């Protein structure tokens, strides 16, 4: 009996961490509509439904959302697929041309600056001999002045030929479910109070991740996953300031963003089978786009995040907010997309407060670019086409991204400023539950039995 | 309504259980280990990584005594300096995750001993069927 013999055991539950490519799959209702309505109707598989989320007991797997993988490769995959949805579309190489711009028909005041210009220019036709004088409406941010007369050109002409988005494809989020291949598994922290670092007492394996809708947003991440009961702030090292502070609050704040202009698009032929979608006339009042949140719910959620930020910074601490210190337009304020058009909507109205240790609404104004330079490449831009009619959408603000200032010299107040920066902090706010492991069978163990001859 | 034993019999359902109780279900972990325009290459190399790793594991079984037994008695004694634990404490105390860290340091000695044992068994069986 004391002569213990070894025996191998194949198919043993034991794992280590690993880094592998995962596999996307979206819901079958997105597959009910067909043929490149949005991206990855062909690049992903339809899911096997009701994925096996089975509980796993007596287990303590340490997680880490900050050195996590699958947020790195998702940030690679969405950029690469964003590029893969632009190859069939129209290049705006023939449109880099001298523009003869003028002010739009509107009551004009010298102090005020119009956000739109009325630009006429020569453009080629179906016939290479003939050309046409045609006009469009542009924003101030898309044109620059080249230098009496007043003639303009587009901003991106000196650095990159631009690509119109195809109006057939849409930009709306469809939820991805990331699935592990054969020989791996996805663990999920089912714990409630979990800052994303260290032990999670209740983990559970799962076939595929839950619905991850991809939102593009710099500050104030939208349509996200709410917390269970508390408001949880999350950081890699809170005493450091260069690392962002991902806030996730429980009750969502409804935001209503709109564009009160009534645009008319205008198909301009460039060549054979080439259509450039410009802006025709404005029908109605020339107004400025904006977003609305409720004052009461926003002050309530700021009270919640002050109550939760005082857990790390003392109870006798003044906490105040500010607007952004500076940078490019799509990091000083929160950018998003609403029905296919990009907003850069100022947030100095929200983040102005200070807090002591004891049916209204906010109208905050937006801007609209038509070209974009997402993820800041070297020779890539996207001319987003205009869309018909008055546009509005409704979204639930779910979380925040904050940044502390490096306050030396006996700083009692600890001011917090928003900042987007990397897109991955949007993505890390949804993969905080998930990690990937590699199944390693062929366990070996001693027991009391001996193989005969 | 699902029952605790039903999710016990799922994939990785016994990772916190004792290894004596986890030994009753090994076919589940062994089964969800094989099956489950540019992206086809990525999924294709994932599938061939899965089948190639499964073939490496089945070959490491096959060079030992057992090809498809899934529980393999063999004939090298457990050197008690490897773990110095009692029998009934390891089959009723620890999981498999807790055991692997205890034997991660003493491994690739065990695999070479198994290959030596199988080579010795094959030459002894060759001699036995030779004199018959």
């Amino acid at each position: 009996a004391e002569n213990l013999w070894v025996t191998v055991y194949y198919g043993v539950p034991v794992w280590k961490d690993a880094e592998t490519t995962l596999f996307c799959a979206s819901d079958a209702k997105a597959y009910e509509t067909e043929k490149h309505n949005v991206w990855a109707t062909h690049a992903c598989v339809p899911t096997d439904p009701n994925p096996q989320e089975i509980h796993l007991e007596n287990v303590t797997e340490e997680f880490n959302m900050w050195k996590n993988n699958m947020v790195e490769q998702m940030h690679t995959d969405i950029i690469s697929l964003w590029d893969q949805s632009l190859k069939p579309c129209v290049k705006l190489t023939p449109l880099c041309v001298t523009l003869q711009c003028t002010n739009v028909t509107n009551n004009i005041t010298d102090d005020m600056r119009g956000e739109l210009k009325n630009c006429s220019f020569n453009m080629t036709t179906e016939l290479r001999d003939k050309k046409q004088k045609v006009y469009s409406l542009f924003y101030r941010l898309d044109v620059v002045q080249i230098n009496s007369n007043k003639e303009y050109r587009l901003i991106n002409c000196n650095t990159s030929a631009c690509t119109q988005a195809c109006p057939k494809v849409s930009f709306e989020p469809i939820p991805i479910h990331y699935c592990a291949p054969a020989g791996f598994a996805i663990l999920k922290c089912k714990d409630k109070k979990f800052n994303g670092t260290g032990p999670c007492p209740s983990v559970s394996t799962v076939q595929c991740t839950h619905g991850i809708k991809p939102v593009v947003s710099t500050q104030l991440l939208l349509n996200g996953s709410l917390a269970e009961e508390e408001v949880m702030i999350r950081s890699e090292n809170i005493t450091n300031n260069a690392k962002n502070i991902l806030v996730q609050f429980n009750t969502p704040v409804q935001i209503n963003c709109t564009r009160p202009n009534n645009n008319t698009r205008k198909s301009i032929r460039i060549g054979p089978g080439q259509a450039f979608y410009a802006t025709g006339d404005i029908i109605g009042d020339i107004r400025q786009a904006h977003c609305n949140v409720s004052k009461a719910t926003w002050n309530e959620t700021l009270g919640k995040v002050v109550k939760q930020l005082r857990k790390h910074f003392g109870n006798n601490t003044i906490i105040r907010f500010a607007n952004s210190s500076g940078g490019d337009l799509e990091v000083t304020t929160h950018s998003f997309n609403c029905g296919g058009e990009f907003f850069y909507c100022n947030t100095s109205g929200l983040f102005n407060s200070t807090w002591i240790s004891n049916n209204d609404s906010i109208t905050l104004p937006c801007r609209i670019k038509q070209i974009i330079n997402m993820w800041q490449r070297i020779g890539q831009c996207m001319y987003a086409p205009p869309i018909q009619g008055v546009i509005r959408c409704v979204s639930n603000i779910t979380g925040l991204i904050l940044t502390r200032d490096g306050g030396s010299t006996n700083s009692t107040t600890e001011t917090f400023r928003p900042g987007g920066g990397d897109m991955r902090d949007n993505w890390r706010s949804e993969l905080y539950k998930y990690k990937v492991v590699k199944i390693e069978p062929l366990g070996v163990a001693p027991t009391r039995c001996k193989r005969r001859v | 309504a699902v029952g605790i034993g039903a999710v016990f019999l799922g994939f990785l359902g016994a990772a916190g259980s004792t290894m004596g109780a986890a030994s009753m279900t090994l076919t589940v972990q062994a089964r969800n280990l094989l099956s489950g325009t540019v992206w086809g290459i990525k999924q294709l190399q994932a599938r061939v990584l899965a089948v190639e790793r499964y073939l490496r594991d089945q070959q490491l079984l096959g060079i030992w005594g057992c090809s498809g037994k899934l529980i393999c008695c063999t004939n090298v004694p457990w050197n008690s300096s490897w773990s110095n634990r009692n029998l009934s404490e390891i089959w009723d105390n620890m999981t498999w995750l807790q055991w692997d860290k205890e034997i991660s340091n003493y491994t690739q000695i065990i695999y070479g001993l198994l290959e030596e044992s199988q080579n010795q068994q094959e030459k002894n069986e060759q001699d036995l069927l030779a004199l018959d």
Partner: antibody, heavy 116, light 113 residues
Framework: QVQLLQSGAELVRPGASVTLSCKAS????????IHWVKQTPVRGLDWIGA????????ASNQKVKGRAILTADKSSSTAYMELRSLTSEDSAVYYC???????????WGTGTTVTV | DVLMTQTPLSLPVSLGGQASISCRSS???????????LEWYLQKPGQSPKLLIY???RRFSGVPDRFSGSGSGTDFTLKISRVETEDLGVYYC?????????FGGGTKLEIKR
């Protein structure tokens, strides 16, 4: 016949240990599970956990985790408890129950009013 | 935690009147078999809790032709035609979907007066 014979009332001082017994009868005992439900009049219905008689599986949720160890004698068909250092909030009406694999709660115990 | 919410809490309903109890989950109740596991219950003072419905609308044998469950996904609702003295007491929602299991918050049915 279709019963879950529990113990009586249990007047147990705090700081001690508490056991239970579900001396069920009527059917096969391997094929049916044993779960455990609390009744407080404050919250309503709460959980402890589960013991699987076939596989030997058992679990307990996080509030009762660190205290409860679920064992059973399959021959005498008696479930058990090991509660450790309860409070007055743990004073509640406990219930041995049964489940099937992919079934539902057929039988219901009488309720042990453990008051501490 | 797939913590359940019951709305409303109290329901004074005259005997013979109608009553309906709503429940909401924080996740989907769907298990891998496709059958979401919801169990509507009973409780009377001085007695053990008992079954009413062990699935979406598949009631337990011993229930008359008045009780029915309904709903989808995360939002579910009970339906009773006529309220009896036997139909009084506290009712409950429950998930048998996946570990950990959760109950509701209890709904007391009383009589209008």
């Amino acid at each position: 016949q279709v019963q879950l014979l529990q113990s009586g009332a249990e007047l147990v001082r705090p700081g001690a240990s508490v056991t239970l017994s579900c001396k069920a009868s009527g059917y096969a005992f391997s094929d049916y599970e044993i779960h455990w439900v609390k009744q407080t009049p404050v919250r309503g219905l709460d959980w402890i956990g589960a013991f699987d008689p076939k596989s030997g599986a058992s679990a307990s949720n996080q509030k009762v985790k660190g205290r409860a160890i679920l064992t059973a004698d399959k021959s005498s068909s008696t479930a058990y408890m090991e509660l450790r250092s309860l409070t007055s909030e743990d004073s509640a009406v406990y219930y041995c129950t049964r489940l099937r694999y992919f079934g539902y709660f057929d039988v219901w115990g009488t309720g042990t009013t453990v008051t501490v | 935690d797939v913590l359940m919410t019951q709305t409303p809490l109290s329901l004074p309903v005259s005997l013979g009147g109608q009553a309906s109890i709503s429940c909401r989950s924080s996740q989907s109740v769907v298990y891998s078999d496709g059958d979401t596991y919801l169990e509507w219950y009973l409780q009377k003072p001085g007695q053990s809790p008992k079954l009413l419905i062990y699935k979406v609308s598949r009631r337990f044998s011993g229930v008359p032709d008045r009780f029915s469950g309904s709903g989808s996904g995360t939002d579910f609702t009970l339906k009773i035609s006529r309220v009896e003295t036997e139909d009084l007491g506290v009712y409950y929602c429950f998930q048998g979907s996946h570990v950990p299991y959760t109950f509701g918050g209890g709904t007391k049915l009383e009589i209008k007066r």
